[PDB]
Design a binder for these strands. Structure first.
Lengths: 46, 102, 108, 67, 119, 146, 297
RNA sequence: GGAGUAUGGUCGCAAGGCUGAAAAAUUGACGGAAGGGCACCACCAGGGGUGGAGCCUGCGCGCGCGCUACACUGACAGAGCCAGCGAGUACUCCCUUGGCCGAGAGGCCCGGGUAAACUCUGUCGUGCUGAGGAAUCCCUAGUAAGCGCAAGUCAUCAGCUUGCGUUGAUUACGUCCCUGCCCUUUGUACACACCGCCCGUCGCUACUACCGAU
C-alpha cells in the first residue's frame, strides 16, 4: 500500500510542478520581452 | 450442462426472459420472491467473485459453498490501510493533538 | 560563467577506497570501471549475435574453392576429443620430400 | 469492467474483425456463380486492360509460370 | 499515371502491376509507381537471371563459376534440370533452386563438411 | 549489503539485514550498488536468515558494495540556556574542548579516510565462441586458428 | 520450405526499412496534395523539389486510398486476415502440474479454434519447426510458479511477434465445483477493446484480435452470446470474458465464465518464439528514470 | 515584414432547477421435435496425480500446487560402459579457539562445527531395520511416468522456475447411446443424384365489426 500511495504522490507532484513552472516562465518572458521590444522600437526611432 | 443453458433455464423459471406473454396471461399472473432470487442468481453465476475448494470436505461429518470473499477482503483491507497508514504518512511530523478524558 | 566559481567551489572530490576488511576480494568497481566492463561485454555480445544470424541463415549447399583446399571442422563424431570447430590450416611445414632430406642429413 | 461490458453489449459495437469476402478485389460486387468525354475515358481504360493482358502473358511466360 | 487519381480501375491496375512485379523478382517495393518509373531495370532482369541468383544465394562464388557450372548442368530447379543460362527465377523459386541428383559439386560440399556418405 | 551469489542478472545479498520480516517491509524497493546499477529488491530469501534477492542490470561483481538509499527523519533537541551574564551562567562546553578535557579521541574510521588507489591497467579476456557455432557457421566466416 | 519462410522473413524486414525511408520522404509528399486542395502556400523548398513533383504525379493515389482507409498496410498480419480460421495451439513448459494443465485446458476452451498439446520431453526449436510444418497461426506457452500460472507468450507465426507477458491475479476454473460452474459454451465470441489509444496500443490490439475466428459479418450485433473484453489502465491489460443473456433491449444479463487475467506485457519481440536474435520492438522498461511513471499504451 | 509552429496570459459562449437516489418493430420474444458434426470439461479401455504422515510458498486454523519418507523394486562390494544445454578479468558454505609476522588498520598457518541410469559378477536373506479411502481431476505417439546435468534471460521464479539430454511403454485411436456443446429446418454456384412445403405460443402491422361512457 505504501508503494502505490507514494508513487501516486510522485506522479501528481511532478505534474503540478512542471505546470507551475511553465506558467511562471511564460508569463515572465512575455512581460520582460514585451517591454524589451518596446524599448527596441523606441531607441530604434532615433 | 452449460452456464449459458442453466442460467437461461433459471431465468425462465423466474419467467423474466421467456416468450412474449398475453394480456389475459398477465391477468392470470395478477390473479395468482423475484428480487432476492435474482440476487442469488447473480451470486451463483458470477462465481469468480470468490474462491472455493473443488473437493468438498475431506471427511463428511453430519451435525445440525463460500469459504471466503477475496474482493471484500481486498476492499476492507484497503479501507483499514488507508484510514491508518495514509494519515500516518500525512501527519509524519505533526506535533500537537487533543487529549480528551471524559 | 567560468569565473563565477570559487576555488574551494571547484575543489572536487576524491574516490573512496576499498575497505580494508575486504581487500582480498578485489578492487572496487566504481563508475568508470563499470563503463569499461560494459562496453567490452557489449561489443562482444553484438559480435556473437551477428554470428548467430549467420549460422541460422547458412545455406547447406554453398560451394567455394576453399572447400577444395582446407580441412573441415566437422564434429566430435569424426574428430574426437580434440575438436573445436576451427578450420585448421598448415602451421607452415609440409611433407618435405626425400632428396632434400638427404641434403639436410649430409649437412648435419 | 462489468458495466463497460454491459455498456458495449447494450450499444453493441464490436472492434473484432469480420470475415471479409475471400476475393474482394476482382469480385467486389459478387453475383452468384449461377443462373441469371467519359467515353474517351472508357476507351482508354479498355486499352489499359489490353496492355495489361499483353504484359501479363509476356511477363509470366517470360518467367516460366511460377506466379 | 495518365489515368485520373480517383479511378477505381486505376488503383486496381496499380496493385496489379506492383503485385505481379513484386512476385516476379524485379522490384523491391509494392507501393510506388515512382519505383516503377525509374527503378525497373534491365540490370534488374539481369539480376534475376539464374546465374546471378545462384551467386547471391551463394551456390558458387562469382558468375563465372556459376555460368560454367550451369553449362555443364549441375543445378536442378525443383525437379527439372537446367541447360540454358537465362532461366528467369521468380522470388517463389529462389528457394527451391538446388543442386542436381548426385553431382560432384554436391560431393564437394559434403566431402568438406564431412557428411560424405556414398549412398 | 554484500553479494552472496551472483547469477547473471539477479543476485542474492548477504550481510545487510537480519530478518525477512524487515525485508518484507522492504519489498519491491530500490537499490543502487556503487558502480551505477539501478535495481529492484524483489523478495526475501528463505533459508539464510538475512539474505535477499534483487534484480540488477548486469551482474554486480563479487567485489561490490550493495547499498540502499534510505532517508531517515530527524528531530533536533530541546535544550535551551539563556545566558544570564549579569547573574552568572553555565555554558555547555565545546566538543573539542570535551575530548581535550577528559582525554578521549576524536574518532575516525580507516575505512572512511580517503586514500588513493592503485588500479591495474584493465585489459580483458579474448572473445570466446561456442563450439556449436564453430561447427555450424557458414564458410566465408569460418574461423581459422591453427 | 524452411528456406522460403526464412527468405520471406528477411524480405519483410527489407520492405520495412524501405518503408522507413520512403515514409520520411512521403512526409514531404503529403504536404503537397492538400496544399493543392486548399491553395495555401507551402515551403518553397518542397515546392522546388523536382523528383518530388515527378514521383508525386506518379504516386498520389496510394496516399488517397490511405486517407480512404481502403488499403491494408504491411505487417506480419494483414496478408490473410478474414480468411483462415486461425488455428491456435497451447502447451506449457517442460513438466506441467495439475492446475496448470487444467488452466491451459481452459484457455484452449477460451480461444475457440484452439487445440491443446502436451509437451512431455520435447525440444523448443523443434516445436517451433513442427508448428511451422503444420502451418499454424499461433502458439502459446504458459508457465507456472507453484500450481499457479505466470507468463503467457502470445506468439504469432509465420514470423510475427512474441508478446511475452507476466500474468497477475489469476484464478482458474477448476476450483469452483462442477455443479456450480458449467461446461463451457464454445461459440465464436465477440471481442471488445477498452482504452487502447497509442499506436503501440493498437499494435497489441492487432496481435490479440487475430487470435479470434472471423465473426460472420451479417448480424454481428444480435447473434452470439459470448464476448471477450480486454481493457487497460496503468499499462495493465486485463481480460474478463462473459456469456451474456439478453432479457430486454434495456437490460442484458452477464455471466462471468472465462478466467480472470490481468497481464502486463513486457516484451513484443518482432521475431518469433525462440529466436534470441530478436528485434526488440518494445519492452516494459523498468529501471530507467521516469519509465516507472510514464505510460505507453 | 510574410508564412507556419508552438507556449501560457486576457475576454465571450458553453454556466439558469416543472425538480427532489433506487424503446423500436411487417424483421420482435421464447421454446419443443426430427437431421448431422464434435469432445478426454462425453461414453468404452487404461494410466497417473492430489487427497494418508510431514515440510512449506501461495490462496481464505482451512485449503491445493510441489517436495520428501515409506522393503524386494534389497543391500554391499568390485568390474564395464554413453549424452545435451554450458564461458563477463567471472564464480567463493559459514563463523569462530590458538599461534606467526605485523608501534597500529590486516595477512598467513592449524584446527572446531568429465551424468543419473544400465549391464555383469560375487556376499547376505524380510528384520518400528509397510505407496495414501470417499472423493475428484488429468491424459491417445516421442503422448505418461522415472532419472538426472546445466542456465538462472528487466517482467514472475530460488521454499524454486526454466531449459536439454537419457530410458521409453499399456490402452483406445470406434462412437454420437449418456452428459453435453455446436449447427442444421434461411439465404450461399448449375450436373448426372436424392428429397419434398417441421411445430408451438404468441407479438407487431392492415382490415372488419363490437362495447359503452363524455
Amino acid at each position: 500500500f505504501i508503494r502505490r500511495e507514494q508513487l501516486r504522490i510522485k506522479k501528481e507532484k511532478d505534474e503540478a510542478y512542471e505546470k507551475k513552472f511553465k506558467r511562471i516562465i511564460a508569463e515572465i518572458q512575455n512581460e520582460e520581452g514585451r517591454a524589451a521590444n518596446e524599448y527596441a522600437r523606441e531607441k530604434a526611432a532615433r | 450442462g452449460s452456464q449459458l443453458k442453466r442460467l437461461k433455464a433459471s431465468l425462465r423459471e423466474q419467467g423474466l426472459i421467456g416468450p412474449q406473454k398475453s394480456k389475459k396471461q398477465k391477468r392470470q399472473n395478477a390473479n395468482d420472491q423475484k428480487a432476492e432470487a435474482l440476487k442469488s442468481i447473480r451470486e451463483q453465476f458470477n462465481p469468480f467473485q470468490f474462491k472455493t475448494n473443488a473437493r468438498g470436505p475431506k471427511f463428511e461429518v453430519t451435525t445440525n459453498v463460500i469459504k471466503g470473499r477475496p474482493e471484500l477482503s481486498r476492499a476492507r483491507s484497503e479501507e483499514k490501510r488507508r484510514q491508518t497508514i495514509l494519515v500516518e504518512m500525512q501527519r509524519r511530523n505533526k506535533v500537537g493533538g487533543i487529549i480528551d478524558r471524559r | 560563467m567560468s569565473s563565477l566559481r570559487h576555488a574551494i567551489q571547484r575543489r572536487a572530490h576524491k574516490e573512496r577506497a576499498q575497505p580494508l576488511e575486504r581487500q582480498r576480494l578485489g578492487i572496487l568497481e566504481k563508475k568508470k570501471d563499470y563503463r569499461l566492463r560494459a562496453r567490452d561485454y557489449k561489443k562482444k555480445q553484438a559480435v556473437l549475435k551477428s554470428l548467430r544470424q549467420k549460422a541460422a541463415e547458412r545455406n547447406e549447399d554453398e560451394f567455394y574453392f576453399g572447400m577444395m583446399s582446407r580441412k573441415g571442422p566437422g564434429s566430435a563424431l569424426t574428430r574426437g576429443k580434440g575438436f573445436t570447430g576451427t578450420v585448421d590450416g598448415d602451421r607452415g611445414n609440409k611433407a618435405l620430400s626425400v632428396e632434400t632430406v638427404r641434403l639436410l642429413k649430409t649437412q648435419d | 469492467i462489468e458495466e463497460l461490458i454491459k455498456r458495449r453489449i447494450l450499444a453493441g459495437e464490436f472492434d473484432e474483425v469480420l470475415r471479409r469476402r475471400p476475393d474482394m478485389f476482382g469480385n467486389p460486387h459478387g453475383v452468384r456463380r449461377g443462373l441469371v468525354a467519359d467515353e474517351k475515358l472508357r476507351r482508354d481504360e479498355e486499352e489499359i486492360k489490353r496492355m495489361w493482358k499483353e504484359i501479363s502473358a509476356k511477363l509470366d511466360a517470360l518467367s516460366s509460370w511460377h506466379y | 499515371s495518365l489515368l485520373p487519381p480517383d479511378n477505381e480501375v486505376r488503383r486496381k491496375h496499380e496493385t496489379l502491376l506492383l503485385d505481379k512485379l513484386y512476385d516476379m523478382g524485379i522490384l523491391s517495393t509494392k507501393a510506388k509507381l515512382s519505383a516503377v518509373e525509374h527503378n525497373v531495370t534491365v540490370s534488374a532482369f539481369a539480376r534475376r537471371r539464374l546465374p546471378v541468383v545462384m551467386t547471391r544465394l551463394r551456390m558458387a562464388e562469382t558468375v563465372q563459376a556459376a555460368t560454367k557450372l550451369i553449362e555443364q548442368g549441375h543445378v536442378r530447379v525443383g525437379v527439372e534440370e537446367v541447360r540454358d543460362p537465362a532461366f528467369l527465377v521468380t522470388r517463389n523459386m529462389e528457394d527451391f533452386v538446388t543442386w542436381t541428383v548426385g553431382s560432384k559439386i554436391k560431393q564437394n560440399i559434403m566431402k568438406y563438411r564431412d557428411k560424405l556418405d556414398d549412398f | 549489503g554484500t553479494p552472496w551469489k551472483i547469477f547473471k542478472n539477479t543476485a542474492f545479498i548477504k550481510d545487510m539485514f537480519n530478518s525477512s520480516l524487515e525485508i518484507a517491509k522492504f519489498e519491491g524497493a530500490a537499490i543502487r550498488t556503487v558502480s551505477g546499477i539501478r535495481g529492484q529488491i524483489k523478495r526475501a530469501l528463505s533459508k539464510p536468515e538475512g539474505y535477499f534477492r534483487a534484480t540488477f542490470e548486469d551482474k554486480i561483481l563479487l567485489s561490490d558494495i550493495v547499498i540502499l538509499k534510505a532517508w531517515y527523519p530527524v528531530k533536533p533537541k530541546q535544550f535551551y540556556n539563556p545566558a544570564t551574564n549579569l547573574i552568572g551562567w553555565q555554558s555547555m562546553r565545546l566538543t573539542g574542548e570535551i575530548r581535550r578535557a577528559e582525554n578521549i579521541p576524536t574518532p575516525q574510521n580507516p575505512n572512511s579516510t580517503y586514500r588513493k588507489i592503485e588500479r591495474p591497467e584493465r585489459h580483458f579476456n579474448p572473445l570466446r565462441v561456442p563450439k556449436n557455432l564453430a561447427a555450424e557457421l557458414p564458410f566465408k566466416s569460418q574461423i581459422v586458428q591453427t | 520450405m524452411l528456406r522460403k519462410q526464412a527468405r520471406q522473413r528477411r524480405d519483410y524486414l527489407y520492405r520495412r526499412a524501405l518503408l522507413l525511408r520512403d515514409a520520411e520522404i512521403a512526409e514531404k509528399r503529403a504536404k503537397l496534395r492538400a496544399a493543392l486542395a486548399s491553395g495555401k502556400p507551402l515551403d518553397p523548398k518542397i515546392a522546388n523539389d523536382k523528383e518530388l513533383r515527378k514521383d508525386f504525379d506518379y504516386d498520389v493515389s496510394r496516399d488517397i486510398a490511405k486517407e480512404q482507409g481502403e488499403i491494408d498496410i504491411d505487417d506480419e498480419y494483414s496478408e490473410l486476415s478474414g480468411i483462415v480460421d486461425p488455428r491456435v495451439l497451447v502447451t506449457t513448459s517442460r513438466d506441467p502440474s495439475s492446475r496448470l494443465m487444467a488452466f491451459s485446458k481452459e484457455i484452449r476452451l477460451m480461444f475457440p479454434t484452439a487445440i491443446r498439446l502436451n509437451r512431455g520431453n520435447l525440444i523448443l526449436p523443434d516445436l517451433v519447426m513442427s508448428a511451422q510444418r503444420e502451418r499454424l497461426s499461433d502458439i502459446i506457452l504458459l508457465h507456472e510458479h507453484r500450481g499457479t500460472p505466470t507468463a503467457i507468450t502470445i506468439s504469432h507465426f509465420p514470423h510475427g511477434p512474441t508478446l511475452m507477458a507476466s500474468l497477475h491475479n489469476v484464478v482458474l476454473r477448476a476450483d469452483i465445483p462442477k455443479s456450480i460452474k458449467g461446461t463451457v459454451s464454445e461459440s465464436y465470441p465477440h471481442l471488445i477493446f477498452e482504452g487502447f489509444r497509442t499506436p503501440l496500443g493498437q499494435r497489441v490490439v492487432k496481435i490479440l484480435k487475430h487470435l479470434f475466428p472471423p465473426r460472420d459479418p451479417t448480424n454481428n450485433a444480435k447473434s452470439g452470446n459470448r464476448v471477450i473484453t480486454f481493457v487497460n489502465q496503468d499499462d495493465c491489460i486485463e481480460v474478463r470474458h462473459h456469456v451474456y443473456v439478453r432479457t430486454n433491449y434495456n437490460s442484458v444479463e452477464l455471466s462471468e465464465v472465462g478466467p480472470r487475467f490481468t497481464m502486463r506485457p513486457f516484451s513484443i519481440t518482432m521475431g518469433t518464439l525462440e529466436n534470441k536474435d530478436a528485434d526488440v520492438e518494445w519492452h516494459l522498461s523498468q529501471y530507467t528514470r521516469t519509465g516507472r511513471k510514464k505510460n505507453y499504451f
